[PDB]
Design a protein around this ligand. Structure first.
Ligand SMILES: Nc1ncnc2c1ncn2[C@@H]1O[C@H](COP(=O)(O)OP(=O)(O)OP(=O)(O)O)[C@@H](O)[C@H]1O
Ligand SMILES: Nc1ncnc2c1ncn2[C@@H]1O[C@H](COP(=O)(O)OP(=O)(O)OP(=O)(O)O)[C@@H](O)[C@H]1O
Ligand SMILES: Nc1ncnc2c1ncn2[C@@H]1O[C@H](COP(=O)(O)OP(=O)(O)OP(=O)(O)O)[C@@H](O)[C@H]1O
Ligand SMILES: Nc1ncnc2c1ncn2[C@@H]1O[C@H](COP(=O)(O)OP(=O)(O)OP(=O)(O)O)[C@@H](O)[C@H]1O
Ligand SMILES: Nc1ncnc2c1ncn2[C@@H]1O[C@H](COP(=O)(O)OP(=O)(O)OP(=O)(O)O)[C@@H](O)[C@H]1O
Lengths: 362, 362, 362, 362, 362
DNA sequence: AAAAAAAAAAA
DNA sequence: TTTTTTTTTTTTTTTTT
């Protein structure tokens, strides 16, 4: 009896695999009998234990095939083909709505009865983050609104300030919240042409730690970042489709993503300054540090950088009407949950503790 | 039973798919029955809902085949094959006439009863654009003639002027009106060879914000853009064919397309300056800036940037005698439609508001 | 009869062959009759003599196949596919636990009846190393915890001291104990791109002798090393992901590995000094030097550089309960063996011989 | 009847063909009748005349076959696979023993019945070289043992002496005997990254003309090489692995090979001076020069630069028990030949003529 | 019935054809009936008219094949394989025997066809060169034999003279006779590696305008040429192999080729000068100058530079015994042409007119 | 190493 | 011929600047 190419394609679609070796590596695990399957007993990985029963009968045949890498290749290209259609035909609202469903699915695991997290530590993360900037949840909401409208020449924000001011702590959380990739523009220009190739089909990009010339009297290291970035004006604008490439691939033509620039206290050319909507100044304020010194778990679990900490902050602060009508049901249930197993008096004490510079928890 | 490779080729022709992953992604949607297809019920995308019921019977087989990507490759190469025949056998007037049918079809949907657009917003865009330059409709019509006649060494216009003067805004609209590609020449020569390969078989190219040198006396940073164009003079001239290249493909030999160069106010070597038929000086106009701030929908929906906002200008201002006979029927009908939905009083009111920096609607 | 592709895949999986020519080479040795196989009689290589008896009947057919390169490719693909899954799904504790029992397989061969390692010389290596630093087994064991937990900021160690003090001796041993690779960031910036590319998917990295720029008056040649680490703050801290590339490969994104920095007694900026959880100072010791002169086999057999010498140290000194539960039973057998082949008076006599430099075995 | 792919592979194995065109060419020579084969009559090439008898029957079928290039590719891959296994599993003793067999095979033909070489001139070469340094045969034998054991910090020998003193001559002969490469460390540190990449998988390296600072009292030209070696201590010491880089390839990790350093009478830093097991003082000897003036065939036939001259010296001077037990049979044979080709008195008369500075054959 | 691939392979070998499209085109011509074939009846090309009748019956089938480029690939590889079998075993005298046999195929163009310049002014070339140096033809033959034997230390000739001294014309002539390449050594040490890498796999080199020091003594310019070439002793003497570098490539090891050095009247250091076999002084000769002033065609038809004029000299002056056996027949077949077309007296008129200072006449 | 396309085995 | 299976090989990227 023949192997089904269809079932391998379906598994790749449900799992969203788009690496041929990962798909091959996963699907070969199903060749062993389900009854004895130690991974299905321990239930370590859902990408295994949800599917082994369904696929065992086909995987036992696949294990004897001579085609194994070409079977997986068709499956992976089917997943990429879907991902390419969705990139052209969804609105940016639907893209973000899908991302929030993915984060909510993670949260439903992380805080499930099998989950390793617990909410007070993540909610302390929300309490610390809401002290990093005034009206923080409005700043996040304005950012998402900006990244969705993608208005030409009005679609990049600048984060500027001293070192150890939380710029990339925040920018990394916004980047996980939306999905996207960080870029380094300080390269020699000959290689920069491949760095921008990372941006293809991303919803968002972050230009991190752009270095200028001058400012050495401020003890800033010099660098070419600002000078390189100033060549990319039509990439920032989004007024026209730019041409993007990867090693051994012919150029894609598409509008460059919106996003963020994070910078220390260099000077900036007017040709760039005209292309940022908003500049947010970050400045150091030691109680946030004293708090982190006295309650470290925020760093050790990477809670403070995580986009899920921002999603919890939005679920906490924002009205239900500000989300997509498709997703409101899940968000109301999460609002009910957070009002049930957490309390406003606790939150107020947490935010007070951060402002006092003591460690957050009791 | 077996897949009809012909039906897949036919669908790619009817929708002009020239990417394999896109064609594969689209054609796999037709697996499910049109009798309950939610995308058909919503009528969300015409390249789906017009075709699903026709192709369902074949796609149900295509989903089982072991060589799907090859079937799509022959289809995509057929589309590119026809596309190359047309580029050699049609006159430039006929090519433009096809493009105008494409825009008019998109308009007939976009302003149809199923369409989203309200024409009053777009005609406000026409009013704003007509304030951008003196005799704007004459400038656009003169540009079209220039791009059609393609006269040797008389093929490029220079858009020059300071920041936020509209150079990119108009260039992007004309680029959509004709169809074409933007090109970045600020990169170094070593990989510039693969950028120019994007111009193969295009009707226009646009060179965007070509960085000059010595502009620092006005705080404009220097770059290689002008130095690079001064090495491509035979490409601009169009007197003789040139050789154009894509990764892993052998060189095409053709005459390079005509187009636009956009610049901020650097100086230009006379060797290069001789290539330009015309220079247009753009300058910022305070009332135009004020106007958009009371009518931001023009930017959010990218109206003033679109080619359709120029096509509606031509339909409004120009005599029917200025269009190719094959479309004069449609253009008369569109003149008649606008003569029902508008009156000169409304359009004069819009212009008067723009000239005062008032909101365009009222 | 026809070749079993499955048996070739088993042999690749057991041997962990991921090189197609090596697998083709090994598997072709099996075609000769096992009864006369000199390579088996002499037990020269376990990758041969364990398996030849099993696979002979299949290799005799494989030797006549016309497809041999494909059969070895699919086998090698299967091994690489398993490495992908393990890399993405094991915990760092499981990674190190596998790496330990992999070293125990080497020890079981080395000290077996068929092996060639004199355990007394290796145990003298343990004695010499335990005299290199105070509380050496704690220094090693605390390092392992640090590399497993990978807590941001608290995840790099500094080794500093004069030339000829044991720094790379210990760092090379830790590299074998844990896996990982050495790096040399004394280059100029323009090739750091491919140098840092070595770190992809490594459990550790070691920065080998990063030179300072100042202090050369102590006969300390100036170099770029520490100035480059100042520019790698984010790679060290490990709070956020970074992009890495290899020649001819597209970039991959991951958190940079934890590790060690080693240097001569240069000065260091405090902006970098804050990034080390601990610093170890190494100093020359005449008794160790005179011991090495009188116990040369330690060098000539590369004992003190090896990770197995540190694993023997951990087996000797640490309590069983703090190894991972999977491996504890195998470690108990090794403790019992070492308590059979040695006693505390003998081991103390070796330490005492080192402490006076007389040479270990007397 | 059908082509035996195995028999084609067997010919490639016995001939050590790495080249698929050379193998295709060589194997097609066998298609013509053996009875009349001019090459089998004159017996010029053993790779033909040993094998044409055997393969003729198969080569006839091969000449009609359509797959000819494919059959050769599998054969060549089998030879490459065998070479990679050996490279990972042989001991240095066996690797050297293979080279001696290759040199003896080459000797057996060049001094065979068709022998173009004259053994009297080659033994005059032995007599000349044995006068260049005292106890030369022990110098060669000790060097071989040193390069075979590859013991840490006991791996490099230093050749010092003026222009025209013999350093490059003996180094070239030892490179031919043992195999290896020559490196030029006098380059700027920029290029050394690709110099050292030549050492990958080599049995030896020789550093040529490693020039230093100072020496102007000897009118020596200054250079960087000595300072560069003083930095590369790990490559010399050989205690731990290093990373080696070729062009385009990614870095490989191995123990750097043992070798030789050659220089004029520069001053050597006391740090670098510790890296060498032994120093050899080469000195000009006018009587050897006057012998060469009267013995030009030694230079014109490149005898004294050859490795085979050293192998002849070892065969003459050393006892059979110093050779590897595999090859001792051929050594006995060659002694039993050489002891009747020459008397002791004839060899002493050569060595006497050299010492007199007379023509060696007089 | 079916296409014989072997017949296509025979035709490829008998025509020695080694381009797949050239072979495809020529073999397709045979598909037409030879009874009518105008290319045969006109006897245009032997590669057609010799073979058409034989291959017609096979080409009629080949014309219907779907594999035609496949069939021709195998035929071409058979020729390339045979070419490589020979090249690996070629003696250095046969290498030059080939070069002249090929130059005779080119000279057969002026044999019996009008497709060439008139030979009477080429013999005026022969006569003028034979007045430049004493016994000029011996100098060519002695040099030629010197380059064939490749005897170490006896490999380089030095041409010294001012401007307007003919030395460069003779060097260019010798270069074009032999097939080497010319190298520049006046560069800084930075650049010499890639210059020397030009010499890989090559018969000669020539060194041009190697500048000295102190040239202001005679208003000669200065550059590092002589200072550099003095260091290249191992490249010149040819006693041992050297490794040579092309850009973007790994090194190759070979014995650097013999050649010519051309130099102005600078001071040459004895340490360099001793490496030449022979110095030839070139000196200006006013009668030769007045001849070539009066016989412009010597220069303007390239005659005195073109190396084929040196063969044309050797062809006449030298015995038939001095040439290699496989071209002796071809020269004596050539020799009689000049013995029919010219006489000793008219050649002496050419010589006499050159010596008189007048153009060649009668 | 991936992409373009050829080249061969089994029905 | 038709379908399934195996193979060829380079270009690009890197190197050079
Ligand atoms: N406002 C603040 N005041 C004091 N300490 C801060 C503040 N924000 C962040 N920190 C501390 O700074 C550390 C580093 O933060 P982060 O990496 O976000 O800084 P950054 O200035 O954006 O850095 P970079 O430009 O190098 O990415 C945090 O882990 C936290 O301990
Ligand atoms: N002539 C104008 N006067 C005032 N505002 C303008 C004008 N043209 C455009 N704008 C505003 O400036 C924005 C940017 O315009 P645009 O990018 O086309 O200018 P540009 O002159 O091409 O600029 P740059 O040199 O920075 O690329 C527009 O979206 C619009 O909001
Ligand atoms: N504490 C010590 N005192 C004296 N000799 C030592 C000591 N530790 C090691 N040695 C010897 O000195 C050699 C040099 O030390 P090691 O190999 O670790 O290099 P290092 O000079 O300390 O490191 P690096 O080259 O990275 O600066 C060792 O290989 C060993 O032979
Ligand atoms: N001991 C010697 N005495 C005199 N002449 C010698 C001696 N050894 C070699 N020669 C001559 O010197 C020539 C150069 O010698 P060799 O190739 O060994 O280079 P070298 O002396 O090491 O010098 P360099 O540093 O220039 O490479 C030899 O070809 C030989 O003719
Ligand atoms: N013996 C001669 N006397 C006078 N003129 C000569 C003589 N030989 C050649 N000529 C003419 O002088 C020209 C210059 O000489 P040639 O081309 O050989 O260069 P060269 O003397 O080597 O000079 P340079 O070093 O400047 O290249 C020749 O091309 C030829 O026209």
């Amino acid at each position: 009896k023949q192997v089904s190419w269809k079932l391998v394609t379906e598994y790749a679609m449900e799992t969203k695999c788009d690496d041929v070796l990962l798909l091959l590596g996963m699907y070969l695990e199903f060749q062993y009998s389900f009854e004895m399957c130690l991974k299905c007993i321990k239930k370590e990985q859902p990408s295994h234990y949800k599917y082994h029963e369904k696929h065992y009968a086909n995987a036992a045949i696949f294990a004897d095939s001579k085609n194994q890498k070409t079977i997986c290749q068709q499956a992976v290209d089917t997943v990429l083909a879907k991902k390419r259609v969705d990139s052209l035909q969804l609105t940016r609202e639907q893209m973000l709505t899908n991302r929030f469903n993915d984060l909510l699915d993670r949260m439903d695991i992380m805080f499930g009865s099998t989950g390793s997290a617990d909410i007070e530590e993540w909610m302390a993360g929300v309490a610390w983050l809401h002290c990093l900037l005034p009206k923080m949840d409005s700043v996040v909401y304005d950012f998402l609104k900006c990244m969705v409208y993608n208005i030409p020449k009005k679609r990049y924000w600048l984060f500027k300030g001293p070192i150890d001011s939380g710029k990339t702590t925040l920018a990394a959380a916004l980047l996980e919240l939306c999905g996207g990739k960080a870029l380094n523009v300080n390269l020699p220009l000959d290689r920069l042409n491949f760095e921008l190739g990372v941006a293809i089909d991303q919803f968002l990009v972050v230009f991190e730690d752009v270095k200028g010339t001058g400012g050495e009297s401020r003890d800033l290291p010099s660098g070419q970042g600002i000078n390189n970035l100033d060549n990319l004006r039509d990439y920032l604008d989004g007024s026209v489709k730019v041409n993007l490439e990867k090693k051994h691939l012919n150029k894609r033509t598409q509008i460059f993503p919106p996003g963020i620039v994070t910078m220390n206290e260099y000077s900036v050319p007017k040709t760039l300054q005209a292309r940022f909507v908003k500049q947010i100044d970050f400045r150091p304020k030691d109680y946030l540090k004293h708090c982190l010194e006295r309650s470290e778990f925020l760093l050790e679990k990477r809670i403070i950088q995580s986009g899920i900490a921002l999603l919890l902050m939005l679920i906490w602060y924002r009205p239900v009407a500000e989300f997509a009508q498709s997703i409101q049901s899940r968000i109301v249930e999460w609002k009910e949950r957070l009002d049930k197993e957490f309390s406003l008096s606790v939150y107020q004490k947490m935010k007070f503790n951060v402002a006092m510079g003591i460690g957050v928890l009791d």
